[PDB]
């Protein structure tokens, strides 16, 4: 079958300001099958209130979803987003940078 | 939390058969225990540890129950998952085999309905319909009890492709609820339409005289890969269509060589889809002199 | 509104 | 400007895993707008954008009786295309359909779609004509002889030309101080050194909807399309997008760069350049 690995894009909603409330987005796309494990990442560990847009795709028939968790940024705290799909050996984390 | 259990490659299976009860949970095939619905909260087999699917083979009476899996769940107040899903395995074969008819019959049109009523002079208290395929479900009715016979009638429609296919019904008596008959005798139940119909004709023509050939022409512009040849009252060809130089696609069904003839239809169908027909054809009348 | 496709097959 | 009205499906089958599982979602734009998910507990058409709430119990009625048909009728296409390609019946497989409308400013029909895929790859579509199919391969000539018997095209040109469009021009009046009230991106340029004699300009463009973006580089005005990254356009999460586009420049020479922003929100192209 064709399989596609999946795009990964970690950022938030705003720009981000210590101590404001904000949204954390894993966005990932152009994968295929569909099936696909995200984890939204703080200080390692995985948090639990993450919802995701509905499964959709692209024109060349890959998938794309966002997940997204509320989150107020500090300086002391590093996010990432944790992905896997049969395509990975090995689940693939992206860190959220701030700076870009 | 909860492990999705499945039997495979049917849950209604025949005694001396084969079925495989997997559960899935966490990502994984293994470690998991069943349960069987009177006993709840007692694993069976004392509570083996599946390190894997659970294959029954070959299944007897015993086998048959109403299952649920729980996996190993290492940082919990259990040290395991909720109940999962429940899948019935029904072992078929433990009594004699009622008997299922369609109304008005099997050739049914596409967006109509149809009554398959399985039927039998054994009591049976409940009745089963079980279309053939992996992964199917059989629908569940009450016996009605009249005149020494116990029947149910399964309402199937509006017609689809989906619901055409060989259908098979079973009875269970009271006490050994998961226990299935044998099974009737199979129905094909067909969906004709909405392909176009194609044309019926006879050659040299309808009227034979004895000791003469009559063969049956079913023709259609529409790339029909098969033409069925279906008689009134009878008798139930298949032919592979070919097509023509004027483009038409055609399957020529010699009789003889003694058919006594009667009305007869044609009806198109394709490759791999073997109970959706098209539309009949309009009839045609042989009469064998 | 969403396409109503009365028994359409592969 | 134009319009579009997009149904995406997906059904699956996934064998020890779960039930086959057919999922919805409608889309006007970029704007979702319905989903449905077999897999939910009592499955429905459900509301995906605050303008279609108030449509009454008679959409949604209507929407999910349709949305089950359908379900019921992809399952049975995935066991079809099983046979269709000789696999297992232990793997798992993914059918996808899309169709829709494109209408321009007088809302009137500009071109109808209707494009189908089997496990990521093309299988059969609606030609621009409407009453014609091109099939991919010999797998699909058998769908195509299915179609053209039954005269399959007819009923999707009959809903392209009417329900589609005219839904499409109700929902774009429901949805009118969202849907055809062009969002412009906010901008800048942000500037990172990657060694003691090169650095990255970044440009940005946040909160902007539609999708559709225009974003280059130029230096002294030639465009450094070879030379720039681009990412993929990304959701906000708030029903906006967001883009950037970065180049490698000598240290010293920011000022030869500037970014340029084309946007349907924008009455006219914006210039960007780094200031400290
Ligand atoms: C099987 O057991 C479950 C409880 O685990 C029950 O809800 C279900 O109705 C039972 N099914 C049958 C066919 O008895
Ligand atoms: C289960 O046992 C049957 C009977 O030996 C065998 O045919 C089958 O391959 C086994 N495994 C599965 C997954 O059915
Ligand atoms: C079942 O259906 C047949 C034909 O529709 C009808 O003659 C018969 O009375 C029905 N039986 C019952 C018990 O309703
Ligand atoms: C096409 O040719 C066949 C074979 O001779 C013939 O039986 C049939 O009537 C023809 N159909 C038309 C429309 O000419």
């Known amino acids: 079958m064709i399989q596609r690995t999946p795009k990964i894009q970690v950022y938030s909603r705003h720009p981000a300001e210590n101590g404001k409330s904000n949204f954390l987005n894993c966005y990932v796309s152009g994968f295929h099958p569909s099936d696909i494990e995200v984890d939204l990442l703080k200080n390692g560990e995985r948090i639990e209130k993450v919802e995701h847009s509905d499964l959709s795709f692209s024109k060349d028939w890959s998938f794309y979803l966002l997940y997204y968790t509320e989150f107020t940024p500090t300086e002391k705290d590093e996010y990432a987003c944790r992905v896997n799909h049969v395509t990975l050996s090995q689940p693939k984390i992206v860190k959220w940078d701030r700076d870009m | ?289 | 509104a969403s396409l109503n496709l009365p028994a359409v097959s592969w | 400007g134009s319009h579009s009205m997009r149904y995406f499906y997906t059904a699956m089958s996934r064998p020890g895993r779960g039930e086959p599982r057919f999922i919805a979602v409608g889309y006007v734009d970029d704007t979702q707008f319905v989903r449905f998910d077999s897999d939910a507990a009592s499955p429905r058409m459900a509301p995906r954008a605050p303008w279609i709430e108030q449509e009454g119990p008679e959409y949604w009625d209507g929407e999910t009786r349709n949305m089950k048909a359908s379900a019921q009728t992809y399952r049975e296409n995935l066991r079809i295309a099983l046979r269709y390609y000789n696999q297992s019946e232990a793997g798992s497989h993914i059918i996808q359909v899309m169709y829709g409308c494109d209408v321009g400013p007088d809302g009137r029909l500009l071109r109808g779609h209707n494009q189908y895929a089997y496990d990521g790859k093309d299988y059969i579509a609606l030609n621009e004509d409407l009453s014609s199919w091109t099939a991919a391969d010999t797998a699909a000539q058998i769908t195509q002889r299915k179609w053209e018997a039954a005269r399959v095209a007819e009923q999707l040109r009959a809903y392209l030309e009417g329900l589609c469009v005219e839904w499409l021009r109700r929902y774009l009046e429901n949805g009118k101080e969202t849907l055809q009230r062009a969002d412009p991106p906010k901008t800048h340029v942000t500037h990172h050194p990657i060694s003691d004699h090169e650095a990255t300009l970044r440009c940005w463009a946040l909160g902007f909807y539609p999708a559709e973006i225009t974003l280059t580089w130029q230096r002294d005005g030639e465009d450094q399309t070879q030379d720039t990254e681009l990412v993929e356009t990304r959701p906000a999460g708030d029903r906006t997008f967001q883009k950037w586009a970065a180049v490698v420049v000598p240290s010293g020479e920011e000022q030869r760069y500037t970014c340029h922003v084309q946007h349907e929100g924008l009455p006219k192209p914006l210039t960007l350049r780094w200031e400290p």
């Open chain 2, 1 to 289: 939390d909860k492990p999705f259990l499945s039997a495979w490659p049917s849950a209604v299976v025949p005694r001396g058969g084969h079925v495989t009860l997997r559960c899935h949970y966490r990502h994984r095939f293994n470690n998991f225990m069943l349960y069987k619905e009177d006993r709840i909260h007692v694993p069976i087999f004392h509570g083996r540890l599946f390190q894997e699917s659970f294959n029954m083979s070959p299944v007897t009476t015993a086998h048959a129950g109403n299952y649920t899996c729980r996996g190993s769940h290492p940082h919990s107040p259990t040290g395991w998952s909720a109940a999962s899903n429940p899948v019935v395995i029904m072992v078929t074969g433990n009594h004699r085999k009622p008997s299922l008819l369609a109304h008005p019959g099997p050739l049914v049109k596409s967006g109509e309905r149809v009554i398959l009523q399985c039927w039998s002079d054994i009591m049976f208290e409940h009745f089963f319909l079980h279309k053939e395929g992996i992964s199917k479900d059989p629908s569940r009715l009450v016996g009605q009890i009249h005149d020494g016979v116990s029947k149910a009638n399964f309402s199937i429609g509006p017609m689809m492709f989906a619901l055409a296919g060989t259908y098979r019904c079973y009875g269970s008596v009271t006490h050994t609820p998961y226990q299935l008959s044998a099974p009737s005798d199979p129905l094909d139940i067909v969906v004709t339409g909405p392909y176009e119909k194609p044309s019926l004709s006879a050659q040299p023509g309808p009227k034979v005289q004895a000791g003469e050939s009559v063969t049956l022409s079913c023709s259609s512009r529409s790339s029909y890969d098969m033409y069925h040849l279906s008689r009134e009252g009878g008798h139930e060809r298949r032919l592979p269509a070919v097509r023509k130089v004027n483009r038409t696609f055609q399957a020529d069904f010699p009789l003889g060589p003694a058919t006594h003839g009667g009305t007869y239809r044609c009806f198109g169908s394709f490759r791999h889809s073997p109970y959706e027909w098209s539309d009949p054809s309009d009839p045609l009348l042989v009469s064998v002199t």
